């Protein structure tokens, strides 16, 4: 389970 990048959840 890789950590998502800082902005992975930004449009």
């Amino acid at each position: 389970l890789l950590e998502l990048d800082k902005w992975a959840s930004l449009w």
Epitope: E3, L4, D5, K6, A8, W11
Partner: antibody, heavy 132, light 107 residues
Amino acid sequence: RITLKESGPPLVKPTQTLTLTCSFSGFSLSDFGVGVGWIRQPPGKALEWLAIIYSDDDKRYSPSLNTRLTITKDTSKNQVVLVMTRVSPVDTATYFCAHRRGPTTLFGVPIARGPVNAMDVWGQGITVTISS
Amino acid sequence: LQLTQSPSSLSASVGDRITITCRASQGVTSALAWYRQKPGSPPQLLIYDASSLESGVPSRFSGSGSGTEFTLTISTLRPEDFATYYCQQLHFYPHTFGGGTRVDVRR
């Protein structure tokens, strides 16, 4: 406009600690979302990502190297520092620092992700050799 | 996750159109960049966000893909293009690079 320069020792002995510095111009680390990262290339080999620090002091490290890596920054001095403990000859490489853009913001709010997805500008590199 | 770059090496001559590709172990949306590295030099950004041309980069470069398959494309090879090329993913930590693709003069 953006320039990055690495500084540090050319030769370090094994078991020692290596401290490297990026000094930059053309951006500020108080810019929103801006990151500075470190990458290394072993001689004759591909690039390996080591660490990143953001303007909010958020930092992330390579899992294989996490234990030995510390990243810190000084916003006023325009400098970022990487510390590696317990060096060994594996760690002989050219070490680069690079700048990562923050998101597009309109009037201080982030509106687009896209610019973030690269390291735009790199330093020239500094070569470090670990030998006893 | 791992980034696999094909081919590892390819031969070309000036004015050639070449295509390098990158496959990811998992979906990384569009968070994929491409770099060119000339021997003795630091990598230089070509394409960010999978398809966006870096300001100041010759139009001959172009990129495509989303999800797991990505392709960099040079339409007209120039001399300064004989170099090594890298992709990077920035969707997950840690930000993986590919293994590289050497591009030499054909003979």
